[PDB]
Amino acid sequence: VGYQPYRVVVLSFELLHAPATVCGPKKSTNLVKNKCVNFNFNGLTGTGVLTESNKKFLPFQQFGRDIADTTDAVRDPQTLEILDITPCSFGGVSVITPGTNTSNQVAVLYQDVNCNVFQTRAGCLIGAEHVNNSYECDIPIGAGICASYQTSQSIIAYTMSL
């Protein structure tokens, strides 16, 4: 182990008043999918999820548009994979209040965000339990589901009684 022929190479570097271009600082990062991640694929700095699409592109295109003229599909240059673009922030927030001199606790409603915690058809509702019976509702929410304060006593959500 001390007299065998070893191949020894030396990689020296040059430093002068010349542009540095043989070096490549750009590094191809990991591909992440189904998460709200910012990307810059050659034409835009867009933030959104990258789902697995089922539509193929013709072998000369790089981008993808829709009926509303929005970039929602970009081919991945790493492996020629077609990925969709969908924004993450949807709608605002809403708060259910039983009223003055009735209760103190409130329930928070998300408009178009997908998730004690009940996944209603009108977004995410947190802070109000779901009960299968149906009464006449007073506080409208949407998609046929209301909220109310009944029996201690807490805020409940149910399908409205017609």
């Epitope: 182990v1 590094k27 990062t29 990991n30 992440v32």
Partner: antibody
Amino acid sequence: QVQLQESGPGLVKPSETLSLTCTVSGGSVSSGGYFWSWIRQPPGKGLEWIGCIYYSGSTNYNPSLKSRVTISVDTSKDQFSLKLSSVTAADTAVYYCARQLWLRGRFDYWGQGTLVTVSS
Amino acid sequence: NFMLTQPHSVSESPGKTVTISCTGSSGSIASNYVQWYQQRPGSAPTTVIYEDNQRPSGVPDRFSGSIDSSSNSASLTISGLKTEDEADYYCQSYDSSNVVFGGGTKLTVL
């Protein structure tokens, strides 16, 4: 930043199978082109290197611990686990999950060591 | 069959400059990079030097390392010993796809 946390039971019977998983938060397993390594340290003795893994199937093992280590990487759960076979009474060591910046370099970040004891 | 030889017990009063060695048996000590780890009792080890002469950001400048390749020994020089310095010191190697650690040196005080 990024941290490493271990899990799994602190006990294993002799001549059994060990299952300890090290989870990662604040980073990605397959991103950055880094390595993962398991290092053990018995109480009162020096550190012992078990093996190192890549986010692909590349593995290299200690010849004293060869044919007994089984380490796998699951990118979906952002964690990697080590499996040990034929554990004996001399395997009492504090197991450290340390990220390895450079293969022949140093483990820049070390996870907290779980205590593993064996008894019959 | 490459193992790092490290002094088991090194003891010194605070304030003097002490040297911790790490000798390789078969392979030369300049063949691969050697990393020193200072580990507190009941705590995870922490890297205190890298590339045999470079101190990572956070450790004091007194963690100076030197390489004596003729004797195949890696040296770590500690100057200005303090109370918190009482910890286990291990030297790392790589050999050939097989990371080998050192014997261990507790920094005992006088």
